[PDB]
């Protein structure tokens, strides 16, 4: 069964070629899921990408309303209509029998007049305002199939995980069914598109995070490397990794609050700017001011990094939006800036309230996108327990990370001294010595290891 | 690229990025006592009292006097607006003893008889009260109103929460924009959370945003744009300032964690006083101790709370963490800060408000309190009691240590059958701090930071060993 | 403006009472205290405000209302023949227009200001109830008479009405609930809404006693003095710097058989011997058992009981709900008017109840004690007999001003105990883990363990 490209980023991969040709697809979902956007972004692509005219049957929205709605996306549905490459067939009774019979002929007329191959009726539910519905639908879908033109059927649902329709007859009548959801994750909303089935061929089974933006529906499917050494900004740290960090690697700094992750990030961001290489600093824990000021405590003028167009500080709250939204805001700035290296301080912040699965998917997306663009990225994680921590991360996301720089507090006599350690180094040698290091106005200072101490991991070492 | 209209609702203009769609219908569904009628009333008042535009109010149940009377609670004299020819309570009430085209034709009269731009129909559910019998009628009114080019604010009712957005499960798709008012209650507390479900053609803030009804209307709660300085402020203990490398930073969040009765409430007392000694304003929010017990306890430390109370340089606001929801609590703090306008704030204790509240809802509070404290350049010291007295593995059980700049970890140390304490600056952002677990004693002159336990091992545990 | 209902608490929750000239809807399950509220609402305004009240019945006979009123010691008979109260029967002998007709008439024969209708459910129909409701409601508002309309319900957290039309049909809606917390019940009044003026939100625990509805709201505005009181143990008085505080809350925490009941009893004797009144709320031991162990400690409770100085009340932690328990506490406190109150124990009362429902009770008795210049010592038994890292499993150590720590210490194959003043709000205390032995004449607080390490773990190590 041949398929038609929708030019919707992600959807072509989720359906494996797009939607089955000369067949009607069902796109049901709650209010404000992006059903009408999925229909106005369908045809919108088949004109400015394959020059194949399109028809839009509206059952409530006026031809001017949709013309004004697509104006937010930057699309001109008025120029496409006047250019004869689009036609909005109004089905709204201007203030039950021959309605279908008539409307069907009005569609066949336009479809057979504009030489169009893609149609979309939105919404079929509103028109019916079971046996009559599921029955009078077959005729529409049948007649739609007779003119051999793929179409999109916009339907609405009350519950989010309840019925996949409204009358229970919207389904078992369509060949292909796509479901748009706006799942409420406590207080945050997460839209997920899932193809329930596609009569004929195969596709991606399950849910896939998407978002509406200036570019339209941006769906993200999950199922979609030189030995060049790079400096970290710390002389002694580059030696503990056997040269430095790999150009195409994911460094991860972990340890309790006040360990020095934010310090390592600052130097791993300034070192770039020092070598005519630009870098992005994704702040979430503190503001730009505090970064500049606290950064200024150790030198590295973060102001000159902005004037040289080599440093971009993006600060925003970890609950300001949802992972799907956050990930989009990340990749976006990366493309606009083209940074040599990025930095998320911190990951633990984005793991607050979000579900582990939704987090794991996020880290994979960010890391994956960063790894498949030759962009060296460092990620910070704060350990819940400041001492005695038996896990590097409580999110179980270490396998994704390539390097691990573990920081921890050491109780020496009656004082608190931190201890830097290269936990692992993928594709290189690393120092296996738990070295101690202080923090001064000139940044980090690595020294000797605790060779004459015991139970260093615990956080309460013992002398010999 | 869509004409937006400011609602002048504290927050609502930040959620939709401008307000509501111009010349379009907006649905505001929700249960009884959610704030549907208030919202609509505030949509008119704000609309007329600022931009100078005529509003129409289509009442169904309540009479054109009730709205005028109820609205007076927030200091809104409709009498001045009803007589000045700005507002008009178009009565559509069933007589105390399906003509949609009728009202639709009557509504156009007032709209055109005032040269409007805003309208609001209270509970269009009371007309129909057949899903198809409603959608057709609903669509007609919204469609008709659309040609008028006036922004309509609908109001529907909801039977059960976390289910249908309306009552007939059709009204949502009958309007262009759908705002859902919620009054979800966790246990025995309530929480008002407004959300924009949809907004055809434009962008908005997705998800649920906490709000509260007050005597100033609906107050919604929506950016990491604050300031920072190297200005240092005293903590009230010279020994402590030396441990912080001069004293606490002015614009920063200080968290003092430790077991029950370690000196957290002591450090607060000495912190709320150093403001009063420098002729600076300071507020104290007590959620455990009482103004009597607080003032008394503090007097055994040569601190005259009563004196500073009368010098208008100190405010003690005692209240129970289970008295109201986390949303109200936040508004109170913000209100007391906008009224007294202090340079130092003190929440005793953060652990008190975390009791019987979801960590996520509680994190939001700390972000709301801390955030509003940093942007206003107000030094905030927060107290947190650990669930474990000795052997504390994590710094906070609520996990809010990544949101604090300075941390002062107090704890007990079983030393030779005795029970001493030990103050320590765990971390200090943009400053050097003493990294030593120094022993201290309490007395009639406050704290006493002495030497460290240099000849002791496993100090953090609770039971130190001799080396 | 609102009309003071003079109901224990409700006047605070409603921030005054019921809006004057507006009908307030009161709905709940069968046995939530609807009729009572409607009755107590009228009897108050008549007996105090001197406001004629009219009661409309539909299923209950006028000879039953006055028959049930005698249960709370209310004489409706007098009020009937006196013309202060009038009961209008609208229950057909074994239509809507004639109701308000007779109602409006009966609201003028006595110049009535309060009206109570029970119920607006037995009268009924689809939207008819949503049409027949406005008729009465609008008619009552025309006569500016504060009405107490009722509603019926089958679900506690389901619909707010039996039709779901009267919900948003009124202005002020109050919801009563008889929620089943496992095997026991919990009455909770709540004000859903009130168009015009502010009010308290959320649920509020209420009880039904022989004095009507007793709702316990919220308000931390008591007093605090430096008056020192004894504890019964001389050395225990010196470890607090001159004994306990009159205006203070003391807590005795430890495993099982540390000396909590021994230290409780001694606290009740000192009050008695000082010619002061004391009450013991025993929930674990029994009268006969408490009278035995006490005699085995040198103190006699019979003597102190016969001298009307020591009241002893024992019950089961599952006998009734927290709201009921609190009532008996507040109730038995007033009548006896003690100088010292002792609860043994808060642990037994925590078991089965929820942590949130438990704290509320602890904030009730705690608050009520401190707000009555009465001293309170509360016993809490820990779940771990050795190796506890929390003072309470319910985390109520922030509510207590003084804490006593009793723990076992395995010392050379012997299981000795240890007293220690953990904290003393506004006083100096001894910061030492003093060993103590229990015997005939009560407890013997001896020396501490200066030659022992890690004593707070249960199993220390002698360091010579
Ligand atoms: N430019 C934009 N930026 C962000 N979000 C947008 C933008 N344009 C539209 N949206 C979002 O996409 C959705 C648009 O509604 P759409 O008409 O696509 O959905 P629908 O499923 O047809 O809903 P309805 O039943 O209300 O018609 C809304 O959730 C809206 O917030
Ligand atoms: N000017 C300075 N001189 C010396 N040490 C400093 C200076 N400024 C900060 N520090 C040290 O650096 C620490 C902060 O390091 P950093 O900001 O990297 O912490 P972090 O591990 O990221 O913690 P968080 O979880 O709060 O983000 C402070 O605790 C302090 O000891
Ligand atoms: N006048 C005094 N002299 C000596 N020690 C005192 C004096 N007043 C109080 N203390 C000690 O200091 C403690 C005060 O504890 P504070 O309330 O400051 O700390 P906290 O940890 O916040 O307490 P809580 O857990 O009750 O909130 C008392 O428990 C007592 O041990
Ligand atoms: N005459 C006595 N001589 C010596 N010890 C005694 C005597 N009477 C009681 N005890 C001691 O007192 C202990 C009981 O004390 P108490 O009843 O106060 O315990 P508790 O800490 O309240 O524990 P629980 O409530 O779980 O029983 C006994 O286990 C015993 O060791
Ligand atoms: N070339 C190398 N020389 C020395 N050690 C190496 C080298 N490559 C890898 N390693 C060590 O092996 C670790 C990774 O081994 P790997 O098989 O990936 O383990 P795992 O599956 O547990 O992550 C590195 O972190 C490092 O310690
Ligand atoms: N002055 C006020 N202060 C605080 N809350 C108020 C005030 N006036 C009204 N309210 C609250 O407003 C709510 C009524 O909102 P309303 O506009 O009637 O919405 P709805 O129709 O959805 O119930 C009630 O919960 C009431 O307590
Ligand atoms: N004299 C009394 N003392 C204590 N409790 C009582 C007394 N009389 C009734 N009760 C309790 O209070 C309840 C009050 O019920 P009522 O006011 O009729 O409410 P409803 O109309 O919702 O059934 C009774 O069902 C009973 O459990
Ligand atoms: Mg649509
Ligand atoms: Mg960090
Ligand atoms: Mg305190
Ligand atoms: Mg006992």
Curated annotation (Swiss-Prot), chain B:
Q: What does altering residue 438 to C do? A: Higher affinity for KaiB, extends the period of the circadian rhythm to 55 hours
Mutagenesis or variant effect for residue 457 to A: Constitutively phosphorylated
Query: Where does the record place the modification Phosphothreonine?
Result: 402
Tell me the impact of changing residue 401 to D: Poorly phosphorylated by itself or KaiA, mimics phosphorylation of this residue
Which InterPro entries does UniProt cross-reference here? Circadian_clock_KaiC-rel, Circadian_KaiC_bact, KaiC, KaiC-like_dom, KaiC_C, KaiC_dom, KaiC_N, P-loop_NTPase
**What happens on changing residue 222 to S?**
In kaiC5; induces an arrhythmic phenotype
Which intervals of the chain are annotated as region A-loop, interacts with KaiA?
458-467
Q: How is its activity regulated?
A: Interaction with KaiA stimulates autophosphorylation, KaiC interaction with KaiB sequesters KaiA, preventing it stimulating the KaiC kinase, leading to autodephosphorylation. A KaiA dimer is sufficient to enhance KaiC phosphorylation. Interaction of KaiA with the A-loop stimulates autokinase activity.
Q: What is the effect of changing residue 379 to A?
A: In kaiC10; extends the period of the circadian rhythm to 27 hours
- Record-listed ATP 1 binding positions: 33-38, 73, 198-200, 202, 204, 214-215
Q: Annotated region Linker: where?
A: 222-230
Provide the effect of residue 401 to E: Severely attenuated growth after 5-7 days in a light/dark regime, glycogen degradation in dark stops early leaving high levels of glycogen in cell, mimics phosphorylation of this residue
Question: Is Kinase there in the keyword field?
Answer: yes
Q: Which residues bind Mg(2+) 1?
A: 37
NCBIfam families membership: circ_KaiC, PRK09302.1
What's the record's remark on domains?
Answer: In the homohexamer the 2 domains (called CI and CII, joined by a linker) self-associate to each form a 'donut' layer; the compactness and local conformation of the domains varies over the cell cycle and impacts function. CII has the autokinase and autophosphatase activities, both CI and CII have (weak) ATPase activity; CI has the clock pacemaker role. The CI ring undergoes structural changes driven by ATP hydrolysis that together with the KaiC phosphorylation state regulate KaiB binding.
| Phenotype when changing residue 203 to W | Increases photoperiod in presence of KaiA and KaiB
Instruction: List ligand-binding residues for ATP 2.
Output: 260-266, 301, 421, 427-429, 431, 433, 435
Annotated catalytic residues: 61 (proton acceptor in ci (kaic 1)), 288 (proton acceptor in cii (kaic 2))
The effect of residue 264 to A is: Induces a long period phenotype, no change in ATP-binding
Annotated protein name in UniProt: Circadian clock oscillator protein KaiC
Q: Which gene encodes it?
A: kaiC
UniProtKB/Swiss-Prot annotation, chain C:
Phenotype for residue 126 to P = Shortens the period of the circadian rhythm to 21 hours in reconstituted KaiABC complex. Increased endogenous ATPase. Higher CI ATPase activity, clock speeds up
Variant or mutagenesis effect after changing residue 119 to P: CI hydrolysis rate halves, increases period of the circadian rhythm by nearly 50%
Q: Which intervals of the chain are annotated as region A-loop, interacts with KaiA?
A: 454-463
Q: Name one GO biological process term.
A: negative regulation of circadian rhythm
Mutation: residue 388 to T; reported impact is: In kaiC15; able to suppress the kaiA2 extended phenotype
PTM annotation (Phosphothreonine): residues: 398
Query: What does the UniProt entry list as the effect of changing residue 217 to S?
Result: In kaiC5; induces an arrhythmic phenotype
What GO MF annotations does this protein's record show?
ATP binding; ATP hydrolysis activity; DNA binding; identical protein binding; magnesium ion binding; protein serine kinase activity; protein serine/threonine kinase activity; protein serine/threonine/tyrosine kinase activity
Binding-site positions, Mg(2+) 2: 261, 284
Keyword entries, A-Z: ATP-binding, Biological rhythms, Hydrolase, Kinase, Magnesium, Metal-binding, Nucleotide-binding, Phosphoprotein, Repeat, Serine/threonine-protein kinase, Transcription, Transcription regulation, Transferase
Give the EC number(s) under which this enzyme is classified.
Answer: 2.7.11.1, 3.6.4.-
Give the catalysed reaction(s), semicolon-separated: L-seryl-[protein] + ATP = O-phospho-L-seryl-[protein] + ADP + H(+); L-threonyl-[protein] + ATP = O-phospho-L-threonyl-[protein] + ADP + H(+); ATP + H2O = ADP + phosphate + H(+)
The superkingdom of the source organism is: Bacteria
Q: How is the cofactor bound?
A: Binds 2 Mg(2+) ions per subunit, one in each domain. Mg(2+) is required for hexamerization and phosphatase activity.
Q: Which residues bind Mg(2+) 1?
A: 35
Outcome, altering residue 359 to C: Decreased endogenous ATPase
Query: Known consequence of changing residue 205 to S?
Result: In kaiC4; extends the period of the circadian rhythm to 28 hours
What result follows from mutating residue 53 to A? Lowers the amplitude and distords the waveform of the circadian rhythm
Q: What is the effect of changing residue 453 to A?
A: Constitutively phosphorylated
Report domain KaiC positions.
Answer: 1-216, 227-464
Give the recorded effect for residue 90 to L. Reduced binding of KaiB, reduced formation of KaiCBA, still phosphorylated
Function in brief: The KaiABC oscillator complex constitutes the main circadian regulator in cyanobacteria. Complex composition changes during the circadian cycle to control KaiC phosphorylation; KaiA stimulates KaiC autophosphorylation, while KaiB sequesters KaiA, leading to KaiC autodephosphorylation. The Kai complex controls chromosome condensation, leading to a transcription accessible chromosome during the first half of the circadian cycle and a compact, less transcription-accessible chromosome during the latter half. Clock output pathways impact the RpaA transcriptional regulator.
Family assignment from sequence similarity: Belongs to the KaiC family.
UniProt-recorded name of the protein: Circadian clock oscillator protein KaiC
């Amino acid at each position: 069964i041949a398929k038609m490209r929708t030019m919707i980023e992600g959807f072509d991969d989720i359906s494996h070629g797009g939607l089955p040709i000369g067949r009607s697809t069902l796109v049901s979902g709650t209010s404000g899921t992006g059903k009408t956007l999925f229909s106005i972004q369908f045809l919108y692509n088949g004109i400015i990408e394959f020059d194949e005219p399109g028809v839009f049957v509206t059952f409530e929205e006026t031809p001017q309303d949709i013309i004004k709605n697509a104006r937010s996306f930057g699309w001109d549905l008025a120029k496409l209509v006047d250019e004869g490459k689009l036609f909005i067939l109004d089905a709204s009774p201007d203030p039950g029998g021959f309605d279908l019979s008539a409307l069907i002929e009005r569609i066949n007329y336009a479809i057979q007049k504009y030489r169009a191959r893609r149609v979309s009726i939105d919404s079929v539910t509103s028109v019916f305002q079971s046996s009559v519905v599921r029955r009078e639908l077959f005729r529409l879908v049948a007649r739609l199939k007779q003119i051999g033109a793929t179409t999109v059927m916009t339907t609405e649902r009350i519950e989010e995980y309840g019925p996949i329709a409204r009358y229970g007859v919207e389904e078992f009548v369509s060949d292909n069914v796509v479901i748009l959801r706006n799942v409420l994750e406590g207080e945050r909303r997460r839209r997920t598109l899932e193809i329930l089935k596609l009569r004929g061929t195969s596709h991606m089974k399950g849910e896939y995070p998407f978002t509406i933006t200036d570019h339209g529906i941006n769906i993200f499917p999950l199922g979609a490397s030189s030995n060049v050494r790079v400096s970290s900004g710390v002389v002694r740290l580059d030696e503990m990794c056997g040269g430095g960090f790999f150009k195409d690697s994911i460094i991860l700094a972990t340890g309790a609050t006040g360990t020095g992750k934010t310090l390592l990030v600052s130097r791993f961001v300034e070192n770039a700017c020092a070598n005519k290489e630009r870098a992005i600093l994704f702040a979430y824990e503190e503001s730009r001011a505090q970064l500049l000021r606290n950064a200024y405590s150790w030198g590295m003028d973060f102001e000159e990094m902005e004037r040289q167009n080599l440093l971009k500080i993006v600060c925003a709250y970890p609950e300001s939006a949802g992972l799907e939204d956050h990930l989009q805001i990340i990749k976006s700035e990366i493309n606009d800036f083209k940074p040599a290296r990025i930095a998320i301080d911190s990951l633990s912040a984005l793991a607050r309230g979000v579900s582990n699965n939704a987090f794991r998917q996020f880290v994979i997306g960010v890391t994956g996108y960063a790894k498949q663009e030759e962009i060296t990225g460092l990620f910070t994680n704060t350990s819940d327990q400041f001492m005695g921590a038996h896990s590097i991360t409580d999110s179980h996301i270490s396998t994704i990370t390539d390097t691990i720089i573990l920081l921890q507090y050491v109780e020496i006599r009656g004082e608190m001294s931190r201890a830097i350690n290269v936990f692992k180094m993928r594709g290189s040698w690393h120092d296996k010595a738990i070295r101690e290091f202080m923090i001064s106005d000139k940044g980090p200072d690595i020294k000797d290891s605790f060779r004459n101490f015991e139970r260093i991991i615990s956080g309460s070492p013992t002398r010999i």
